[PDB]
Write an enzyme that holds these catalytic residues in place. Sequence first.
Site, PDB file in Angstrom:
ATOM      1  N   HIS A 151     -12.039 -16.901  -3.675  1.00  0.00           N
ATOM      2  CA  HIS A 151     -13.104 -15.970  -3.333  1.00  0.00           C
ATOM      3  C   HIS A 151     -12.686 -14.541  -3.639  1.00  0.00           C
ATOM      4  CE1 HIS A 151     -16.438 -14.863  -0.173  1.00  0.00           C
ATOM      5  NE2 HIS A 151     -16.782 -14.573  -1.416  1.00  0.00           N
ATOM      6  N   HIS A 155       0.833  -1.201   0.000  1.00  0.00           N
ATOM      7  CA  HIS A 155       0.000   0.000   0.000  1.00  0.00           C
ATOM      8  C   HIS A 155       0.872   1.257   0.000  1.00  0.00           C
ATOM      9  CE1 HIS A 155      -3.845  -2.189   1.066  1.00  0.00           C
ATOM     10  NE2 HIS A 155      -2.925  -3.089   1.365  1.00  0.00           N
ATOM     11  N   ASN A 185      -9.986  -2.655   4.126  1.00  0.00           N
ATOM     12  CA  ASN A 185      -9.843  -2.620   2.676  1.00  0.00           C
ATOM     13  C   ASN A 185     -11.196  -2.334   2.035  1.00  0.00           C
ATOM     14  OD1 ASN A 185      -7.094  -3.093   2.645  1.00  0.00           O
ATOM     15  ND2 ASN A 185      -7.292  -5.319   2.392  1.00  0.00           N
ATOM     16  N   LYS A 241     -20.157   1.700   4.269  1.00  0.00           N
ATOM     17  CA  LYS A 241     -20.545   1.782   2.870  1.00  0.00           C
ATOM     18  C   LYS A 241     -20.522   3.222   2.370  1.00  0.00           C
ATOM     19  CE  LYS A 241     -23.709  -2.170   2.873  1.00  0.00           C
ATOM     20  NZ  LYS A 241     -24.000  -3.271   1.906  1.00  0.00           N
ATOM     21  N   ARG A 244     -15.864  -4.117  -9.648  1.00  0.00           N
ATOM     22  CA  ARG A 244     -15.355  -3.342  -8.524  1.00  0.00           C
ATOM     23  C   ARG A 244     -13.855  -3.488  -8.321  1.00  0.00           C
ATOM     24  NH1 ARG A 244     -19.886  -3.410  -3.649  1.00  0.00           N
ATOM     25  NH2 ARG A 244     -21.731  -3.200  -5.011  1.00  0.00           N
TER      26      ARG A 244
HETATM   27  C1  HEM Z   1      -1.053 -11.060   8.077  1.00  0.00           C
HETATM   28  C2  HEM Z   1      -1.571 -10.347   7.075  1.00  0.00           C
HETATM   29  C3  HEM Z   1      -0.996  -8.961   6.697  1.00  0.00           C
HETATM   30  C4  HEM Z   1       0.226  -8.448   6.954  1.00  0.00           C
HETATM   31  C5  HEM Z   1       1.418  -9.129   7.661  1.00  0.00           C
HETATM   32  C6  HEM Z   1       0.266  -7.097   6.422  1.00  0.00           C
HETATM   33  C7  HEM Z   1       1.339  -6.238   6.464  1.00  0.00           C
HETATM   34  C8  HEM Z   1       1.304  -4.910   6.137  1.00  0.00           C
HETATM   35  C9  HEM Z   1       2.382  -3.956   6.290  1.00  0.00           C
HETATM   36  C10 HEM Z   1       3.779  -4.260   6.865  1.00  0.00           C
HETATM   37  C11 HEM Z   1       1.949  -2.767   5.855  1.00  0.00           C
HETATM   38  C12 HEM Z   1       2.760  -1.456   5.840  1.00  0.00           C
HETATM   39  C13 HEM Z   1       2.176  -0.488   6.864  1.00  0.00           C
HETATM   40  C14 HEM Z   1       3.034   0.746   6.957  1.00  0.00           C
HETATM   41  O1  HEM Z   1       4.122   0.781   6.327  1.00  0.00           O
HETATM   42  O2  HEM Z   1       2.620   1.701   7.656  1.00  0.00           O
HETATM   43  C15 HEM Z   1       0.575  -2.911   5.417  1.00  0.00           C
HETATM   44  C16 HEM Z   1      -0.225  -1.917   4.890  1.00  0.00           C
HETATM   45  C17 HEM Z   1      -1.591  -1.974   4.768  1.00  0.00           C
HETATM   46  N1  HEM Z   1      -2.363  -3.114   4.870  1.00  0.00           N
HETATM   47 FE1  HEM Z   1      -1.666  -4.997   5.208  1.00  0.00          FE
HETATM   48  N2  HEM Z   1      -0.970  -6.822   5.856  1.00  0.00           N
HETATM   49  C18 HEM Z   1      -1.770  -7.943   6.008  1.00  0.00           C
HETATM   50  C19 HEM Z   1      -3.072  -8.053   5.570  1.00  0.00           C
HETATM   51  C20 HEM Z   1      -3.931  -6.989   5.434  1.00  0.00           C
HETATM   52  C21 HEM Z   1      -5.361  -7.004   5.653  1.00  0.00           C
HETATM   53  C22 HEM Z   1      -6.151  -8.257   6.077  1.00  0.00           C
HETATM   54  C23 HEM Z   1      -5.839  -5.767   5.416  1.00  0.00           C
HETATM   55  C24 HEM Z   1      -7.292  -5.220   5.516  1.00  0.00           C
HETATM   56  C25 HEM Z   1      -8.285  -5.942   6.050  1.00  0.00           C
HETATM   57  C26 HEM Z   1      -4.709  -4.936   5.051  1.00  0.00           C
HETATM   58  C27 HEM Z   1      -4.760  -3.597   4.728  1.00  0.00           C
HETATM   59  C28 HEM Z   1      -3.684  -2.738   4.688  1.00  0.00           C
HETATM   60  C29 HEM Z   1      -3.728  -1.298   4.462  1.00  0.00           C
HETATM   61  C30 HEM Z   1      -4.999  -0.443   4.213  1.00  0.00           C
HETATM   62  C31 HEM Z   1      -2.471  -0.851   4.510  1.00  0.00           C
HETATM   63  C32 HEM Z   1      -2.032   0.611   4.320  1.00  0.00           C
HETATM   64  C33 HEM Z   1      -2.151   1.339   5.653  1.00  0.00           C
HETATM   65  C34 HEM Z   1      -1.696   2.766   5.475  1.00  0.00           C
HETATM   66  O3  HEM Z   1      -2.459   3.556   4.854  1.00  0.00           O
HETATM   67  O4  HEM Z   1      -0.585   3.094   5.966  1.00  0.00           O
HETATM   68  N3  HEM Z   1      -3.565  -5.710   5.068  1.00  0.00           N
HETATM   69  N4  HEM Z   1       0.214  -4.241   5.603  1.00  0.00           N
END
Ligand code: HEM
EC number: 1.11.1.6
Lengths: 499, 499, 499, 499
Positions: A191, A72, A145, A234, A200
Amino acid sequence: NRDPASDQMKHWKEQRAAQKPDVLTTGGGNPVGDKLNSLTVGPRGPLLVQDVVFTDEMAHFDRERIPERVVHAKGAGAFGYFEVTHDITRYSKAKVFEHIGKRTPIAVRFSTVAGESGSADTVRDPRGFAVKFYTEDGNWDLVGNNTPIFFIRDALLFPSFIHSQKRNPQTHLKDPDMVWDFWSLRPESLHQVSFLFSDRGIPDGHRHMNGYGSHTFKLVNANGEAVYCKFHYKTDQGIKNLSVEDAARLAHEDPDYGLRDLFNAIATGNYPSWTLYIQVMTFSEAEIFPFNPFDLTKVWPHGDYPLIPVGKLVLNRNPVNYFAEVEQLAFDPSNMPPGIEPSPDKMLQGRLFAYPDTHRHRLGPNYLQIPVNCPYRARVANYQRDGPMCMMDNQGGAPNYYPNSFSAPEHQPSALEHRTHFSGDVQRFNSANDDNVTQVRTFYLKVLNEEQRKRLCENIAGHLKDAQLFIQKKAVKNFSDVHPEYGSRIQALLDKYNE
Amino acid sequence: NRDPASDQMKHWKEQRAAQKPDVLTTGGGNPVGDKLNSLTVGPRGPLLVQDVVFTDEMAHFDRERIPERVVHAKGAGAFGYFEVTHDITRYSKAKVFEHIGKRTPIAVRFSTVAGESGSADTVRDPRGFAVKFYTEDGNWDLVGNNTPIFFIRDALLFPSFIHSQKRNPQTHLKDPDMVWDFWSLRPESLHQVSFLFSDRGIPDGHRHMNGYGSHTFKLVNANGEAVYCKFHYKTDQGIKNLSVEDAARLAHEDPDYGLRDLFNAIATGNYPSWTLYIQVMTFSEAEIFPFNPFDLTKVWPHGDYPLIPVGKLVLNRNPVNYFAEVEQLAFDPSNMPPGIEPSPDKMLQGRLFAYPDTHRHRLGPNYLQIPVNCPYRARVANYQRDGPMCMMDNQGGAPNYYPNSFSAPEHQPSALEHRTHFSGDVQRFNSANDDNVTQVRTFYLKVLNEEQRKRLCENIAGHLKDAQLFIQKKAVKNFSDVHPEYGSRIQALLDKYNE
Amino acid sequence: NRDPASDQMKHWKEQRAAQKPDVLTTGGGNPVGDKLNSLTVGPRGPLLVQDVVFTDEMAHFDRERIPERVVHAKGAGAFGYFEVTHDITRYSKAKVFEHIGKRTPIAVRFSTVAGESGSADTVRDPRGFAVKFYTEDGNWDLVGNNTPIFFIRDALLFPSFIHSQKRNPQTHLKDPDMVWDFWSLRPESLHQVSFLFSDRGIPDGHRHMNGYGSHTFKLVNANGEAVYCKFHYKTDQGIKNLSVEDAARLAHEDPDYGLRDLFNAIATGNYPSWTLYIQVMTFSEAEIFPFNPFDLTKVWPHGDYPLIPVGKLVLNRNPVNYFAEVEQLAFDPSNMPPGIEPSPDKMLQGRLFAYPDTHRHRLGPNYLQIPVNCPYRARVANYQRDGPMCMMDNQGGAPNYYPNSFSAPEHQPSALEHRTHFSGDVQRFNSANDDNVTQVRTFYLKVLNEEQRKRLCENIAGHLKDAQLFIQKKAVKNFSDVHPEYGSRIQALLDKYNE
Amino acid sequence: NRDPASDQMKHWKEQRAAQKPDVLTTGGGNPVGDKLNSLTVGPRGPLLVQDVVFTDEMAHFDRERIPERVVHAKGAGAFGYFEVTHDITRYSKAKVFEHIGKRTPIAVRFSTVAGESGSADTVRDPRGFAVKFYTEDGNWDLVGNNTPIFFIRDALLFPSFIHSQKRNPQTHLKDPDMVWDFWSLRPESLHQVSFLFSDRGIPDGHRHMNGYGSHTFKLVNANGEAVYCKFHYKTDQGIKNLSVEDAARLAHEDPDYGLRDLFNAIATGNYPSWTLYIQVMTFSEAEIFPFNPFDLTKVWPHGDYPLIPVGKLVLNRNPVNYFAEVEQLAFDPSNMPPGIEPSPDKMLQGRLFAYPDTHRHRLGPNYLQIPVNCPYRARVANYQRDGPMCMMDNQGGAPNYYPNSFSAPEHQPSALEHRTHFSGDVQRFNSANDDNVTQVRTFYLKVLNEEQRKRLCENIAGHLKDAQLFIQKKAVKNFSDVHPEYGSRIQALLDKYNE
Ligand code: HEM
C-alpha cells in the site's frame, strides 16, 4: 539583490547598525586581546598551553556535532500557531480544543526519511511532518508524515525496514537488493509503496503536501466517553509535485530546495497553513470494521468516515538559530495531554518507548530542559531530580519523594486514563496475512487515472530493475496480487530494462 | 526542635503553607492521574508499554548520576561575595580589584582529595578551597587548597600520585605500599607530607582552615607592568583542628560533619569569612630567589615577602539544590580576567588544560551554559556554535566566522597578555633534585614546637608501618635527610610497630 | 608479613621476576623517552603543546571516572561456577539445569544499597547479591538481594523510595524525616523494614548471608508446562551477623571490610559457596494462594512450599582488575534463557526495562560488548549494528535486515514464550492495602525470640527518634498494627529518646 | 550480472552456502522464538513491558548513531600495506623505514571536507588522504590531504574557516557571503583557493589524486641529527580530474561515486598504489629559506628541494564492516614514532591537540581500544586506567603509579625528543602579512597553461558572483595582487554574471 535567505547576514548587520559590536570573550567571559595569532615563543616557535584562548575555542569546535537522528535526519524547521475553528469538545476534553479561536504556539519540522544530514531534498521518500503543540496541559507532539499509512504494521520490523532503506553494512552504498528483498518478502508494504512511487513521492517543497497522524488515536471527552480518530491536516497551498526530471536537476542544483523554499516563503509574508480535520470511529464501529482499525497499512475510507474540521496550522516565524531551534527539536508521541490517548496499534505502541529513548541518547538525559523542547506553558513539578546538564533550580529544596507529609506536588485524579477491557492470550500474534491488497486495488483502479498508473509503473520499474531477477519475480507477483495489469505492466518494463 | 539542616523540609512546607500544591506532571508537562499504581491488564496482570508515566520517570531516574570528580569528589558548597578593602591596583588591573568597597559574587566548594562521594569528611587529607569570582571581565576561578604547597612539582606525575592515593587496581582497597612507595621514590613530597600529617591535616570543618592558591601567579596593571604573586585567604574564625581520636569517632558518627557544619553556620547567620592577602615578587626578585620561585613545593618566606591585604570573602548563602549548584560547579584555573595571568609553574601549566578538559567529559561540551557555571555578569560573544545541550539561542543568526565584514564581535586589543622573554633548549629538564629539604627543616625546627613534632612523627609512623620494610627504610632516610632526629623519632616508632 | 590483599603488588612483582619490564608507551603505542619531566623552553619556561606525551596521559586521567550505579554503588565482586547437583528438568528446560554435574561460569557482585562509592560496608542496609550465569543460551542474570522481600510492590514508587533513602536535595545530608515519612505513609514496608532492623541487617562480610531472587519467576519445561518459582541460595558458611557496636567501629577502622574479607578468603583458598534452592507453585496453587503470589512484600511459607535443591554456587577466583571486571558488571533481569520467564509481579515488570536502560547511560549503548558483560559462551547473531564503541567486526557484511533471501540469522521457534490468558480492565489497580501485617506478625512472634524482639525495637527507635513526632506517631501506629506489643515497645523507647 | 559492490549480499550468502544460519539471539545471547510479532494481550491488544526482545533491539536501534566528524565527514576506507623501497635511514631512525622490503600494515581514509555524511562525492572541495601505519613503535598517523598547502597558517582561524565553509547558523544553507568574506579578508588563502578552483579541485575518485603531509616535519636519525622534511605520496594510477559538467551529473546520479570506484577496484584485483617521497631541508637551509619554512601556505620548490623516494602505499583489502572499520577510524597527527617529530608550524601545533580532543568526544575516552584504532603491532603498557568502555584487562593488577619499586613499565631513554634552541618574546606574532602572492604568481603563470587559467577564473567567477558586490571587489583585488590579468579575467566574467 537576491532572495531573503542569501541576505541573512546583510540583514543581521542592518538590524544592528545602531550599536557597537560586542566584546569577544572566552566561555568564561574573559575578554580576548588577540584571536588571530597564537601565543608562541618567538615568531617561528612552538605553541604554549598558556594559550587557553585557543584551547577554549578549539575544544568547543571539537564537540560541535551531536549524533544525527537515526531516521529523518535532513530536516527543515519553522514556528507558528494552531487556531481552533470548529467545536469537537464532545469528543476531546483536551485544553487545546477548548473554545473556538483558541490559539496554541506550535513548532514544525519537515524532513525526509533515509537521507543523512547532507543529502538532497527533492528525492523519492516519505516526508516527516512533526508538530508540537505547547498546551497548558503540557506539550502535545503529533509526529505525523505526508502519508496516512506506512510500510509495515509491527514495530519489531521497523529497524529492519530502516536498515533496508539505508546503506549496505560493508560497501556503505544504497543497495537495491536490500530495498526490494524486504518489500518483496513483506507484501503488506504494497500500500505505502504504491503511494511512494506516485506523483506525490516527490513534493514540490514542504508547503504543498498534506500531513497525517496515520495512527488511530483515542479521544476522551469530559464525561469519560471515548472514540477512535484519525488526524488529517491538509495543505492550504494545494498539492504540487516535482517531476522525476526536475527533481533530479534540483538534486545537484540545490540540495536544500525545500529548506530555502520554506524560509523564503515565511520571510516574504507567504505564511503556509494547514487545515486540521479528524475522522471519528466509535468503539462499536471498530468491532465491525472489516479490516483491523489499528493496522497502520489501512485507511478509514472517506465515504464511511468523513472529515470533521477542527482548526488551522499556520507557520509565520523562521528559526533564529537552526541548531538550537530545529536540530535539537524532540517530538515524543508519548507526550499526550488529557483528552488524547493512544490506540492499541502495534506500531504506535513501539513509538511510545522509542522516541524518549533515542532522545536521551541523541540530545541527552535532560533534553526536555532545552528551550524548544520545554513545556514552557505548563508548570512542570514532580519528583525527578539530577541528571547530566541540569539547567534550572532542579526544583530547589522541594521534597523529592512521593507521597510525603510536606505538601510537595500531588497527582490530579481527573487526569486518569480511559479504562478499556482486553481479554486474550498473552502471545505474539501473526499479523503478516492481514489484507495486503484490497485498499491498494482501490487506489490503483479508482484513485489513479490511466496516465498516473503509467507513471507509477515506470518509477517502480526504474528502481526495481537493479535488483536480482529472483527479487524482481517476487515483487512483480506481489504487484500481480493487487491487479494483474499492475504486475504485467511492471514486468513489461523490466523485460526491457533487462536488455 | 533540631538543627536547621534537619528541619529543611519542615521549613519548605512552612514557606509554602498558603498556596496549593502543584500539579504533578510528566517531563513533557502532561498531568498524571495516578503515579502510585502502574497500567496493567487486570489486578494481577503484566505491565503495559502504554504506561508512559512509568517510562518517563524510570528513564530519568536511570540517568540521575553523572561521573563524580576524578579528584575532590566529596564536596561542600556555599555562596556569597568578595569585597575589596585595600588598593592593589598598582599591581593588577583586574576589574575585581578596581576600587575599595566593590563587591563581586563568589561560589565556593570545599572538598577532600582521595575519597569518593561517600567518604567521611574528618579524614587526614588536603582540603580543596576553590573560589569562583563572577566579574564583568568574565569568571575568575581561584582553585586553591588549604595548603600553599603540593606533593609534586611536575604535572606528568599527577595521574601517578592520585593513583597512589586511591584504590589498588585489583583489590580496590587503600594500599599503603602504593602510598609510600611513591612518596619515598619522590622526596619532593617531603614538604607537603610534613604539613599533611601534622595538626592541620584534619581541620574542624571548613570554616576553621586557611586557603591558598599555592601557585605563583602574574599580576598586570594598567601600564603593562608585571609582578608575580601568591594568594592567601586566611580564616577569620581561627585555625581549629580535630584530634585523631575525635576525627575517627566523627568518621562513623557523622560522615558529613563538614558539610553539616557549613550549612548550619550560614543558616543561623553565623557567616564565615576569610581575609585575602597577596605576596608580591618583582621580576628581578625572581631571578635572585634562592629556589625556583615557581616551584610548587616551595613557599615565599614571610620575613622577605610580607602579606599585603586585599579584601574579604564572605559566605552568607546556602545552596537551594545541592546537585545543580554544587555538584555541577566547574572551576577552571585558566579562567583569568585581564590583570591576572599564569606563571611558568610546571604544575599550573598542566592545570590550564586538565580542568576544562575533564569538565567536557564530566558535565558536557556546553557545561559553561549551566547557570552556576555561567559568566552571568559578562557578555559571552564569540564564534563558537552548537554542541550537545545548547541552552540559549546559540548566538542567534550572528555571523559565525572571523574575520567578517558583517559586524560580529571584535577583539579588544587591551586584553593582550603581558610579554615575557624566554631562551633555552626545548627539552625535558629534570626537576627531581631541587632542594627538597631546606624549607622542611625550617618547618620542623622553627615552626613546630616540642609537642607538635612528637605528634607529627606518631601520625607518620601510625600509617607508614603498614608498608613493606624496604619502603619504610627508604622513607625514613628521606626524613633523616631533612633532620636526623626527624628520621630517628619515626624509626623509633616503627621499630615498635613492627613488634 | 601481612594479609594477601595488602601483598597484591608484592606478588605481582614476584610473578614477573623472570622477565624484563615492558616499554612505556603512549596510548598509540609510541615509546616514551621520559615521563617525569615536561617539555618546556628552558628549565623555568612555559609548557609546550608539542608535549603530546603529557596531553595523551592527562587527557585519559581526566576521563577515568564513569557514573556510579544509581543504586548499589558500593560493591565487591568475584568469579566462579554454578554446578547442578539435583534434577529439576521436569520444571525447567533451561540448558543451565540440563543434567547433574554440569558447570556454568558465574560472576557475582555483592553490594550495599544507599551508600555511594566511598561509603562503608558495615552499615545497616540490604545487600545486593547479583549472579550472572554464562549459559550456552545466553547470559542469565539473577539479580537478587539478601532478603526474599522488598519495601514496596509497585515500581512507580521505586525512584521515590530511593530518593528518600539517599541525601536531601538541598543539604546533601542523610535525612531521617525523608526515611520515615515515606516508610510511614507506605506501611507495606513493614515486612522488609522488620527484616532490615533485625540481626541480619548488618551481615558479617558477604560470605555469611543468604541470597534470594525475591521475585516470583516462571519455569517452563520441554512439554510447554509452566510453574511459578522462588530462588533461594543459602550460605554454606552459615549465617553470621555483626553487633551494632562492632559494625560502627569497623565503619571507620575498615570502611572496606566486606571487600577485604572476600578477597582474602578466595586468595587463601577458603572459597565461599552457596546452595541454590527453589520453591515451586503450580498455576493452580497461585489461584488459591491467600495473598497475591506476585506481591514482593510476601514470602511463600516453607511448610506449604518446601525448598527444592538444585545446585551449588562457588566463588573461587578474584578479579584481576576491579574496574574492568567489577565496576563495569551489568546484570539485566531481562537476560533470561528459554525455560525461565518472568512472572506478572509489578516490580519485576519494571525491572525488565530499568536495567538495560540505565546500563546504556552508565556504561554505554554497546555495554554488552565489554568482556565481563559479553555472553562469551553463546554465538550472538542478529540485525543490530553500529553504536558508540563498536569493538568486534560488527558481524561483518552480513545482511542487516530481516527477513532476507541471503541466509542471515533465523528465529528458533522452540524459544517462544509460554502463553498465558489474562482478562481485565487496562487500568491502574491500587495495591497499597494488600495485607501488610500478617506475615510480619508471624515474623515478630514465631521467628524471633525474646532477645531478638528486644534488639529489633531498640534499632528501630534508635533511628526513628531523629524524625519529627508526627512521623514517629505514624510509624508506631503502623507497628502497633502488626502487634500491640510491637508498637508499644518502640513507643516506650521513643519516650526516653525524646528526653 | 552486476558490479561487485551491488553483489555484496549475493557473495555473503555464497561464501556461507555450506553452513546453516545462526540462531538469532538477543544482545544478551538469549535465543528468540519470534521476532516478527510483538507480545500483546490479544491479537488487537496493547504491548507489554516483558517483551524484552522488542525493547532490547529497539533500544540499540535508538543508539546506532554517533556524532559525525566535525570536518571530513563523508569518507571511504581501505586497508593495505606500506613497503620500503629506498634507504632513508640516514635521516630517520623510525622503525617503519628500517630496511628495504620492510612491510607495515596501513589503514587509509579518503574524504571531502565540508559535506556532511550524506553529501555527494564529486564536488569542488579538498580531499582527505589519511594514513595510519601500524608500526612496532606504536601507530604513525600521516593525516594528509590532496594538496601540499592550506588556506590559513594559524590554528586560531581554523574553526572560523570551517564555519564559513559550512552552513549559515539560521537558514542552515550554504552562504556564498560567508565563504568569500572570509577568503577576501584573509589573503593567505590565495595559494590554496587557486589550487582548489583548478582542474584538481574535483578528482576522478580517490585513486587518481596525490597525497601530501603539507606540514614541515622533523626527522631524527640514530645519531640524533635532525632535518626537516615533507611527505608526498603521488598516485601510480595517474592524475585524472572530472569536468564541472560531469561532476555535477554524478552528484545526483551517484552521490557515492568515489566510494564505489574504490570498492570495485579492490574487489576486482586492480589495487591502487601510491609512491611515497620526501623533501629534505637541513636546519641551515631553514634559516636562509626565502619564506617561513613552516608556513603551511608555502611549498618547497622542486628545483631547490627534489623528491627522494621512500616506498609504496598499496590498498588491497576492502572493509568488511564500514561503521566499525571506517566510521570509527581515528587519526591523530600526534601519533608519531621515534624518528619523526613535529615542526614549529603553527597549524600542525594545533592539530597535536585537536584530534585526540575531538576523538574522545566523537568516539569516547577509550577510543584507542577500538580494534582498527589499536596499535596492535605494539605492546601498550603504562599507568592509565579505567574510563568509559574499558575493553581488555585494563592492564590487570599491575601497579598504576610511577615511579614504583614493583617493576612496572619503564621509560626508554632513547625515545627522548630532539632538542632545539628557541629564543624570543613569548607573544602572539602577526603572521597575516607573510608573502601571500609570490608562490601563487608562479603557479598562475608558470605551472598552468592558457586553457587551465581560463577555466580557473571561470570556476572562480561561477561561485563568486553569488556574493555581494563589496565582497567581489575585495576578492578581485586580492587576485589582482597576484597578477593583474588574474583579477582582470575574473572581473570581466563577474561583470557578465551580474547582468
Ligand atoms: C515503530 C515504528 C517507528 C519507530 C520505532 C520510529 C523511530 C524513530 C526514531 C528513533 C526517530 C528519531 C527521533 C529523534 O531523533 O528525535 C524517528 C523520527 C521520526 N519519525 Fe519515526 N519511527 C517509527 C515510525 C514512524 C511513523 C509511523 C511515523 C509517522 C506516522 C514516523 C515519523 C517520524 C518523524 C516525522 C520523525 C522526525 C521527527 C523530528 O522531526 O525530529 N515514524 N522515528
